[model samples]
Target: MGKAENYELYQVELGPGPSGDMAAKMSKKKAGRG
Candidate 1:
């Protein structure tokens, strides 16, 4: 039999934006997600 899989997951809480135009500009970057 195969070994059992064990893992731990945690939730991440991101603050409501860094504000100003910086956050808006950074978000425009083309980041691909799998």
Candidate 2:
């Protein structure tokens, strides 16, 4: 079987990826002001 059968699963891995996490964490941190 393949490791992931859907895009969302792969995206979850990417979301937690170091740069991606920090990038979006800053997004959430700043956008909470909007």
Candidate 3:
């Protein structure tokens, strides 16, 4: 629920192109880095 950026991209383009699983993982990585 923390990947709003990716979710928006998914919604804007293919509706479900950038799935939550992918977004979540990437988001988690960045967050951990932070």
Q: Highest lDDT: which candidate?
A: 2
By the lDDT metric, which is better: model 1 or model 3? 3
- What CA RMSD would you report for each candidate? 11.0, 5.9, 9.4
List model 2 lDDT by residue over 1-34, tens digit each: 7655676576776666645666687898889667
Per-model TM-score, in order, reads: 0.24, 0.30, 0.28
Measured with C-alpha atoms, the lDDT of residue 34 in candidate 2 is: 70
Q: Which ten residues in a row have the lowest lDDT in candidate 3?
A: 12-21
lDDT values, one for every candidate: 0.40, 0.69, 0.68
Task: Give residue 9's error in model 2 in angstroms.
Answer: 17
Query: Model 1 over residues 1-34: C-alpha lDDT tens digits?
Result: 5343331111112334335345565667744561
Candidate 2 similarity to native, TM-score: 0.30
